[PDB]
Enzyme design. Structure first.
Site, PDB file in Angstrom:
ATOM      1  N   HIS B  72       1.105  -1.221   0.056  1.00 34.02           N
ATOM      2  CA  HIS B  72      -0.134  -0.003  -0.016  1.00 34.02           C
ATOM      3  C   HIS B  72       0.883   1.668  -0.242  1.00 34.02           C
ATOM      4  CE1 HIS B  72      -3.942  -1.686   1.564  1.00 34.02           C
ATOM      5  NE2 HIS B  72      -3.485  -2.373   0.540  1.00 34.02           N
ATOM      6  N   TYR B 201      -9.449   5.275   7.307  1.00 35.09           N
ATOM      7  CA  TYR B 201      -9.967   5.290   8.927  1.00 35.09           C
ATOM      8  C   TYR B 201     -10.643   6.261   9.096  1.00 35.09           C
ATOM      9  CZ  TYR B 201      -5.241   2.923   9.966  1.00 35.09           C
ATOM     10  OH  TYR B 201      -4.099   2.628  10.193  1.00 35.09           O
ATOM     11  N   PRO B 293      -4.168  -0.511  18.761  1.00 33.93           N
ATOM     12  CA  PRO B 293      -3.796  -1.114  17.354  1.00 33.93           C
ATOM     13  C   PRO B 293      -4.656   0.548  16.057  1.00 33.93           C
ATOM     14  CG  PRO B 293      -6.302  -1.272  18.006  1.00 33.93           C
ATOM     15  CD  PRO B 293      -5.323  -1.058  19.070  1.00 33.93           C
ATOM     16  N   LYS B 297       1.048  -0.311  15.358  1.00 34.06           N
ATOM     17  CA  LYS B 297       2.366  -0.842  16.037  1.00 34.06           C
ATOM     18  C   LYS B 297       2.252  -1.618  16.431  1.00 34.06           C
ATOM     19  CE  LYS B 297       3.059   2.923  13.892  1.00 34.06           C
ATOM     20  NZ  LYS B 297       4.377   2.538  12.105  1.00 34.06           N
ATOM     21  N   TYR B 385       4.398   6.201   9.811  1.00 28.83           N
ATOM     22  CA  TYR B 385       3.815   5.343   9.364  1.00 28.83           C
ATOM     23  C   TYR B 385       3.928   3.838   8.898  1.00 28.83           C
ATOM     24  CZ  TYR B 385      -0.741   2.714   8.742  1.00 28.83           C
ATOM     25  OH  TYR B 385      -2.284   2.141   8.838  1.00 28.83           O
TER      26      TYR B 385
HETATM   27  C1  LIG Z   1      -6.544 -10.057  21.497  1.00 26.21           C
HETATM   28  C2  LIG Z   1      -5.542  -9.137  20.546  1.00 26.21           C
HETATM   29  C3  LIG Z   1      -6.256  -8.150  19.872  1.00 26.21           C
HETATM   30  C4  LIG Z   1      -5.315  -7.881  18.931  1.00 26.21           C
HETATM   31  N1  LIG Z   1      -5.589  -7.271  17.869  1.00 26.21           N
HETATM   32  C5  LIG Z   1      -5.442  -6.136  17.639  1.00 26.21           C
HETATM   33  C6  LIG Z   1      -4.919  -5.833  15.730  1.00 26.21           C
HETATM   34  O1  LIG Z   1      -7.022  -5.649  15.857  1.00 26.21           O
HETATM   35  N2  LIG Z   1      -4.960  -5.177  15.523  1.00 26.21           N
HETATM   36  C7  LIG Z   1      -3.623  -4.690  15.975  1.00 26.21           C
HETATM   37  O2  LIG Z   1      -3.253  -3.717  14.806  1.00 26.21           O
HETATM   38  N3  LIG Z   1      -3.610  -4.869  16.512  1.00 26.21           N
HETATM   39  C8  LIG Z   1      -3.794  -5.713  17.126  1.00 26.21           C
HETATM   40  N4  LIG Z   1      -3.243  -6.595  18.334  1.00 26.21           N
HETATM   41  C9  LIG Z   1      -1.181  -6.787  18.685  1.00 26.21           C
HETATM   42  C10 LIG Z   1      -1.190  -7.406  17.793  1.00 26.21           C
HETATM   43  O3  LIG Z   1      -1.569  -9.317  17.707  1.00 26.21           O
HETATM   44  C11 LIG Z   1       0.565  -7.901  19.047  1.00 26.21           C
HETATM   45  O4  LIG Z   1       1.244  -7.094  19.193  1.00 26.21           O
HETATM   46  C12 LIG Z   1       1.246  -9.181  18.947  1.00 26.21           C
HETATM   47  O5  LIG Z   1       0.447 -10.194  18.547  1.00 26.21           O
HETATM   48  C13 LIG Z   1       1.977  -9.214  19.169  1.00 26.21           C
HETATM   49  O6  LIG Z   1       2.538 -10.345  19.320  1.00 26.21           O
HETATM   50  P1  LIG Z   1       4.171 -11.162  20.358  1.00 26.21           P
HETATM   51  O7  LIG Z   1       4.046 -12.588  19.938  1.00 26.21           O
HETATM   52  O8  LIG Z   1       4.470 -10.658  20.775  1.00 26.21           O
HETATM   53  O9  LIG Z   1       2.721 -11.988  21.219  1.00 26.21           O
HETATM   54  P2  LIG Z   1       1.764 -12.831  21.283  1.00 26.21           P
HETATM   55  O10 LIG Z   1       1.152 -13.097  20.330  1.00 26.21           O
HETATM   56  O11 LIG Z   1       0.207 -12.654  22.142  1.00 26.21           O
HETATM   57  O12 LIG Z   1       1.616 -14.163  21.667  1.00 26.21           O
HETATM   58  C14 LIG Z   1       2.134 -14.367  22.891  1.00 26.21           C
HETATM   59  C15 LIG Z   1       2.689 -15.924  22.846  1.00 26.21           C
HETATM   60  O13 LIG Z   1       2.935 -16.903  23.927  1.00 26.21           O
HETATM   61  C16 LIG Z   1       1.543 -17.518  25.145  1.00 26.21           C
HETATM   62  N5  LIG Z   1       1.744 -17.626  25.981  1.00 26.21           N
HETATM   63  C17 LIG Z   1       0.789 -17.197  27.497  1.00 26.21           C
HETATM   64  N6  LIG Z   1       1.196 -17.178  28.221  1.00 26.21           N
HETATM   65  C18 LIG Z   1       2.037 -18.249  27.999  1.00 26.21           C
HETATM   66  C19 LIG Z   1       2.921 -19.409  29.179  1.00 26.21           C
HETATM   67  N7  LIG Z   1       2.596 -18.960  30.320  1.00 26.21           N
HETATM   68  N8  LIG Z   1       3.479 -19.834  28.627  1.00 26.21           N
HETATM   69  C20 LIG Z   1       4.076 -20.452  27.183  1.00 26.21           C
HETATM   70  N9  LIG Z   1       3.018 -19.724  26.253  1.00 26.21           N
HETATM   71  C21 LIG Z   1       2.405 -18.712  26.914  1.00 26.21           C
HETATM   72  C22 LIG Z   1       0.533 -17.284  24.328  1.00 26.21           C
HETATM   73  O14 LIG Z   1      -0.392 -18.549  24.015  1.00 26.21           O
HETATM   74  C23 LIG Z   1       0.470 -16.991  23.041  1.00 26.21           C
HETATM   75  O15 LIG Z   1       0.925 -17.611  22.007  1.00 26.21           O
HETATM   76  C24 LIG Z   1      -4.437  -7.348  19.130  1.00 26.21           C
HETATM   77  C25 LIG Z   1      -3.330  -8.420  20.722  1.00 26.21           C
HETATM   78  C26 LIG Z   1      -4.219  -8.964  21.576  1.00 26.21           C
HETATM   79  C27 LIG Z   1      -4.105  -9.091  22.380  1.00 26.21           C
HETATM   80  O1  LIG Z   2      -6.003  -5.579  11.093  1.00 27.18           O
HETATM   81  C1  LIG Z   2      -6.496  -4.804  10.173  1.00 27.18           C
HETATM   82  O2  LIG Z   2      -6.161  -4.507   9.067  1.00 27.18           O
HETATM   83  C2  LIG Z   2      -5.697  -3.207  10.917  1.00 27.18           C
HETATM   84  C3  LIG Z   2      -5.340  -2.775  10.051  1.00 27.18           C
HETATM   85  C4  LIG Z   2      -4.887  -1.418  11.007  1.00 27.18           C
HETATM   86  C5  LIG Z   2      -4.251  -0.982  12.149  1.00 27.18           C
HETATM   87  O3  LIG Z   2      -4.571   0.364  12.018  1.00 27.18           O
HETATM   88  C6  LIG Z   2      -5.679  -1.561  12.869  1.00 27.18           C
HETATM   89  C7  LIG Z   2      -5.869  -2.733  12.500  1.00 27.18           C
HETATM   90  O4  LIG Z   2      -5.647  -3.916  13.464  1.00 27.18           O
END
Ligand SMILES: Cc1cc2nc3c(=O)[nH]c(=O)nc-3n(C[C@H](O)[C@H](O)[C@H](O)COP(=O)(O)OP(=O)(O)OC[C@H]3O[C@@H](n4cnc5c(N)ncnc54)[C@H](O)[C@@H]3O)c2cc1C
Ligand SMILES: O=C(O)c1ccc(O)cc1O
Ligand SMILES: Cc1cc2nc3c(=O)[nH]c(=O)nc-3n(C[C@H](O)[C@H](O)[C@H](O)COP(=O)(O)OP(=O)(O)OC[C@H]3O[C@@H](n4cnc5c(N)ncnc54)[C@H](O)[C@@H]3O)c2cc1C
Ligand SMILES: O=C(O)c1ccc(O)cc1O
Lengths: 394, 394
Positions: B72, B201, B293, B297, B385
């Site tokens: 994009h 947005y 979100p 980031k 961004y």
């Molecule tokens: C509910 C939710 C919704 C989100 N929605 C958005 C969104 O719509 N848009 C957006 O831009 N960003 C969103 N985010 C943010 C983005 O998805 C996260 O920043 C990203 O998933 C971070 O990755 P991570 O690997 O750090 O953690 P995670 O993806 O949370 O993965 C960490 C992992 O560790 C595991 N774990 C936890 N505790 C233990 C333990 N005690 N022992 C072993 N394993 C364990 C968990 O099962 C999980 O698999 C969302 C985050 C969450 C929590």
């Molecule tokens: O899921 C998306 O596509 C999405 C897009 C932009 C943003 O800011 C946050 C979001 O979750």
């Protein structure tokens, strides 16, 4: 008594409007509650945007300013030990700001008005406005006990925040926007050489501090102070010790202090009314809006309101396009809101707020770090600081 | 059981770190509480900065992304009837962002990890961390009733916000910064063509709305919703009617709706811990910080933390420069705070807050008007961004 444009207030707004109008052949009378001496005792602002500098030249009141004013190409911001300079000239595409006191601008205009013989009534007491929606509005006032009436076509309310003009519009026609800040600025004027060739805004944990100037031998400093403080609680000695405590050491070390010529506390506030007119009454300057002094936009917004009002009155009188006057508010407000947003932003990143949680302090510190270290960030400050472009009308 | 780097968590962070390390010859074991199916059911994020796109390529897991991801060059912001496009490419000096779902990235990494035979223990229950400051830290967990011990040199806490790793550092060593917002996002995934080729947005009086996508036939939409809402109170029909109400008419008119594949409510929050390490434990991703979100980031900060940790572990193992690991936090935090400031800013200008007075609404509207209409304003949004530059370490 009869005139074309009645002007309430002889501060910067009223005098500038009056001079512009007079020079164009439009008769105007100014009514002022105070004496000339009282008006000249106000210190206030010291920074002029290029736009206001050009307006003064157009009004033919720029000889002293072109001689004594200082042109500044940059300003400094100090936070967390470091000093960052914003090159206004480079970043704004070549614009600068001029440091020339509000007192001096006022004296220059008062002098020019007297020389031309235009009418100014000082000590005009109990000024009242009437028939604002009629074809013939009028003003009544008192000069030494006797009540006199002044007839006119239009009235320009240039009477400041506590003036009578805004109070004369039915409260139901006006929408008010306001924000009061929990601090004021304690300012001090001294006959001492300024600590820096350019201004220094400082964000320090004890509060905001600003190092400014009026000339090579006259300085102006300010420190953020709580709303509870009384100026008599601040001796000169207490002020210098506090200013020094808020500045970086290499700056405080070389500060030349001295007794104050003036010292006062001004509270910080944002205020906007919409619209800025009612019938044949048009508000200009502090009568219509207030901004915290952090961005130095106060006197500068008064100038743009005036530039807009004058050009619209000219069209009305010279060209018979009286209908253009309905556009005053729309035109002024676009600029006012952007200046208000800038002043709000400067205020929030440079001052220390009382109820601040840890996250906000870190966000405040990061705003500074981002805006001061990015070319695009620096340009937003710079273009806003020199003054966004005046709209040309139509 | 023995390994070099123990990794808690198999989300994006843990898998990416694990793949990078494996490819460089550094043994690592990942422990995950859930099953692979559970991890793959999470929809979440969809926007990748160029930096994360390069990290995936470096990890050799980019074939599917180079094929299915959408590049994009701009994004749109709609407010007060108008739509303004921010040309990210032009304004950032040629950078773009890639839309490729978090689910897809996770599947790609899980697939690559299985093919290479690296160790991953799913359903690793009751994971505990020990001897974090010793020369030999270890992890204990349970696989089907029996308690096992895993010895290692370092532990990477990639277990998300509710993980055990951050909880294992003495609370007194950590400084927490947090801000909870009074709203969440209700998201909906649909097997329908997206309403626009680029993201939209939208700041509307009823609340924020966002039009996003996953591919040419899969869409993702979100609407700002109060903290009190339950997802079962939102039928698909209610969601579409509400999305349509918040979008400009020419966009709502051409929206192709359909039944949801997934629907969930995520609350908005900011959270940062300092430092992000303790002894031989290093936090990465959601385990160390959360961002609303709005600026997309979240997944992107996880990637940079990982890129930094991996390059520091490489120096430690290949070059014997184990002392460089002390710099992890300092390096990660500079980027985290700027991303947090950006996400905070996007959040405050695009959403409708409950306790808003008139002045603030006008300031919010003016921020949009200024930032979207100034070349310097647009550049601040654009460079932030696409993603500020990753630091190179030393
Ligand atoms: C509910 C939710 C919704 C989100 N929605 C958005 C969104 O719509 N848009 C957006 O831009 N960003 C969103 N985010 C943010 C983005 O998805 C996260 O920043 C990203 O998933 C971070 O990755 P991570 O690997 O750090 O953690 P995670 O993806 O949370 O993965 C960490 C992992 O560790 C595991 N774990 C936890 N505790 C233990 C333990 N005690 N022992 C072993 N394993 C364990 C968990 O099962 C999980 O698999 C969302 C985050 C969450 C929590
Ligand atoms: O899921 C998306 O596509 C999405 C897009 C932009 C943003 O800011 C946050 C979001 O979750
Ligand atoms: C106390 C104060 C301190 C300030 N300090 C700073 C500062 O440190 N730095 C900075 O950048 N900006 C500062 N400002 C802002 C800047 O000085 C103003 O924006 C500027 O003075 C506006 O000019 P004006 O002509 O609109 O109003 P003013 O300068 O207020 O003049 C309006 C005039 O109208 C007169 N008047 C009032 N009521 C009546 C009436 N009923 N009948 C007739 N005449 C009347 C008043 O006597 C006054 O002369 C300050 C403003 C104030 C009020
Ligand atoms: O008076 C000043 O010189 C001064 C300078 C800059 C500013 O922001 C406000 C001020 O009052």
């Amino acid at each position: 008594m009869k005139t074309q444009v009645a002007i309430i207030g002889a501060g910067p707004s009223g005098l500038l409007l009056g001079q512009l109008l007079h020079k164009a052949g439009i008769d105007n009378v100014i009514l002022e509650r105070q004496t000339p001496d009282y008006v000249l005792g106000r210190i206030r602002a010291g920074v002029l945007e290029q736009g206001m500098v050009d307006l003064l030249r157009e009004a033919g009141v720029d000889r002293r300013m072109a001689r004594d004013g200082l042109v500044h190409e940059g300003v400094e911001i100090a936070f967390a030990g470091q000093r960052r300079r914003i090159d206004l000239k480079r970043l704004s595409g070549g614009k600068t700001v001029t440091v020339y006191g509000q007192t001096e601008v006022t004296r220059d205009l008062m002098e020019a008005r007297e020389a031309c013989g235009a009418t100014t009534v000082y000590q005009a007491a109990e000024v009242r406005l009437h028939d604002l929606q009629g074809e013939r509005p009028y003003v009544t006032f008192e000069r030494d006990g006797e009540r006199l009436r002044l007839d006119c076509d239009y009235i320009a309310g240039c009477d400041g925040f506590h003036g009578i003009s805004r109070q004369s519009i039915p409260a139901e026609r006006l929408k008010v926007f306001e924000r009061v800040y929990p601090f004021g600025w304690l300012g001090l004027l001294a006959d001492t050489p300024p600590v820096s060739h350019e201004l220094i805004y400082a964000n320090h944990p004890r509060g905001f501090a600003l190092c400014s100037q009026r000339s090579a031998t006259r300085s102006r400093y300010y420190v953020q102070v709580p709303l509870s403080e009384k100026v008599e609680d601040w001796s000169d000695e207490r002020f210098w010790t506090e200013l020094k405590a808020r500045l970086p050491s290499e700056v405080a070390e070389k500060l030349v202090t001295g007794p104050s010529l003036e010292k006062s506390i001004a509270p910080l506030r944002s205020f906007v009314v919409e619209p800025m007119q009612h019938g044949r009454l048009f508000l200009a300057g502090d009568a219509a809006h207030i901004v915290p002094p952090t961005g130095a936009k106060g006197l500068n917004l008064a100038a743009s309101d005036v530039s807009t009002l004058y050009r619209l009155l000219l069209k009305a009188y010279r060209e018979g396009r009286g209908e253009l006057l309905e556009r005053y508010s729309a035109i002024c407000l676009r600029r006012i809101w952007k200046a208000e947003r800038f002043s709000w932003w400067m205020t929030s990143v440079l001052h220390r707020f009382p109820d601040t949680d840890a996250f906000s302090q870190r966000i405040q510190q990061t705003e500074l770090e981002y805006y001061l270290g990015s070319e695009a960030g620096l340009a937003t400050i710079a273009e806003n600081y020199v003054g966004l472009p005046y709209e040309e009308i139509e």
